[PDB]
């Protein structure tokens, strides 16, 4: 079937080479996965030596990380925004390594408000009266100075990141190959990477 | 094709280049008659062994003592 052999190529001089043998099995095919977004399905391929290998199709949940905070959570993947290799991989919402994805951003908000005792980007406060000010402004006399005042000074999320938390989504990069592992892990963009990718996105579409 | 046999063998004589040489002929017949040999192959045999001994000796003789 499909083959990865070197012997169908021209040699460096531009000359043809003639084959000496039929196609082997250590030179195999196995067409692409083309992971979409949706309810999970994962098939399993038997490869050289045994060693099953998981090929994902329609993943919808990932394990992403925030490196400044060292805080990693399970999250939902919403959409793909950028793709350095092709552009038809954003029209079809296929999810490959080094893609740029939107995630749900909620568990990071939960951990942040719980760890710092301080809010994210919030517009108005009425929902904070029955609940959430319960977490953020917890009724305790011990700790609530000594601990959380050492949590403060450090709780200075940058302009772009705190602007992200308002619309309820983030920008993340996949750092794992879902076609080989069946997992869509990665890390949320920050700093100059975030600026570069935001400018690229703004420049491409529209 | 694979077999437990050996194929090592060799000839033990060499014919003379000049086939009809009266001197060689009568000298080899003198030698056959006085030692009561059957053939001339039995003279060429001894000639071959003497020639190989001479070759080995001359070969060793050119090295430095």
């Amino acid at each position: 079937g499909i083959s990865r052999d070197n012997w169908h190529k021209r040699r460096k001089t531009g000359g043809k080479r003639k084959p000496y043998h039929k196609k082997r099995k250590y030179e195999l095919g196995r067409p692409a996965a083309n992971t979409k977004i949706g309810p999970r399905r994962i098939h399993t391929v038997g490869v050289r030596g045994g060693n099953k290998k998981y090929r994902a199709l329609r993943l919808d949940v990932g394990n992403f990380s925030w490196g400044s905070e060292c805080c990693t959570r399970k999250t939902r993947i919403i959409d793909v925004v950028y793709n350095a290799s092709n552009n038809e991989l954003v029209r079809t919402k296929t999810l490959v390594k080094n893609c740029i994805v939107l995630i749900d951003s909620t568990p990071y908000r939960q951990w942040y408000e719980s760890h710092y005792a301080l809010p994210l980007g919030r517009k108005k406060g009425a929902k904070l009266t029955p609940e959430e000010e319960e977490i953020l402004n917890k009724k305790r006399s011990k700790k609530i100075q000594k601990k959380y005042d050492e949590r403060k000074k450090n709780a200075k999320i940058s302009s772009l990141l705190e602007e992200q938390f308002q619309q309820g989504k983030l920008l993340a990069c996949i750092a794992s190959r879902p076609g080989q592992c069946g997992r869509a892990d990665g890390y949320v963009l920050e700093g100059k990477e975030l600026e570069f990718y935001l400018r690229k996105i703004k420049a491409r579409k529209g | 094709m694979p077999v437990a046999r050996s194929w090592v063998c060799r000839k033990t004589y060499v014919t003379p280049r000049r086939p009809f040489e009266k001197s060689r002929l009568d000298q080899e017949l003198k030698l056959i008659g006085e030692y009561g040999l059957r053939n001339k192959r039995e003279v060429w045999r001894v000639k071959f062994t003497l020639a190989k001994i001479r070759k080995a000796a001359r070969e060793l003789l050119t090295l430095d003592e």
Partner: protein, 263 residues
């Protein structure tokens, strides 16, 4: 043609220090996978039926081994193509005799009966020192043995004497200039001497010099040195000749002058 691993060995392609004929048949024992490499081992059938003449065919050595008589390094081996190798100990207690596979002088194993008190330990050369999970130091010796928790001052190329019954490294000799050694590969396969030098070529094949007990010097690669003593004093018992490699002229003089024909 060759889609997988092979399992036959031709008699003409077998190692030469097995000292086989060429008229018995097309095939050779083909030692099974073990702790010693294929070209550097000595199967059980060859050691028993060829060097010891205890057996006369392959059936006889099979039915000698199938009676739990032969012990290699303490344990009872039932296979007749087991790859016994350097510094191993054979034990046949039905007759009360123990051997030790060591190259004699001419690049082949000898028959080297030893005392039963000496057939308890064996010397092993260290090839690898790595750390496992939870920071436990491991060893790897020249016969695939793995030791956990060695004292953290033994390194590569050092020799360790181990108890055959328990593992449990007992003592060790260090690779240094001045230590007795036997060469276990190459052209000087069997000769014994002191180190006196170690040339170093970063990137490939650091060579080592040796000088035996008669003023003769010879070099080898570091991959073939085997420290067997502190210096001028072996830890295992040496065979007859003691790796001296007397030349062909001295060989002839000693074989003629002694007139070694019979008793």
């Amino acid at each position: 043609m060759a889609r997988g691993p092979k399992k036959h060995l031709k008699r003409v392609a077998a190692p030469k220090h097995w000292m086989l004929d060429k008229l018995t048949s097309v095939f050779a024992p083909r030692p099974s996978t073990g702790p010693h490499k294929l070209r550097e081992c000595l199967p059980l059938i060859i050691f028993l039926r060829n060097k010891l003449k205890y057996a006369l065919t392959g059936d006889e050595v099979k039915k000698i081994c199938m009676q739990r008589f032969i012990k290699i390094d303490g344990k009872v081996r039932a296979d007749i193509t087991y790859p016994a190798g350097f510094m191993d100990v054979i034990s046949i207690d039905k007759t009360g005799e123990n051997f030790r596979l060591i190259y004699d002088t001419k690049g082949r194993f000898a028959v080297h009966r030893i005392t039963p008190e000496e057939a308890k330990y064996k010397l092993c050369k260290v090839r690898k020192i790595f750390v496992g999970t939870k920071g436990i130091p491991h060893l790897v010796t020249h016969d695939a043995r793995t030791i956990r928790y060695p004292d953290p001052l033994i390194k590569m190329n050092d020799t360790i004497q181990i108890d055959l019954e328990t593992g449990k490294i007992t003592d060790f000799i260090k690779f240094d200039t001045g230590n007795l050694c036997m060469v276990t590969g190459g052209a000087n396969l069997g000769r014994i001497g002191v180190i006196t030098n170690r040339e170093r070529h970063p990137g490939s094949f650091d060579v080592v010099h040796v000088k035996d007990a008669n003023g003769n010097s010879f070099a080898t690669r570091l991959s073939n040195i085997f420290v067997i003593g502190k210096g001028n004093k072996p830890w295992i018992s040496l065979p007859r000749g003691k790796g001296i490699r007397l030349t062909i002229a001295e060989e002839r003089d000693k074989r003629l002058a002694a007139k070694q024909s019979s008793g």
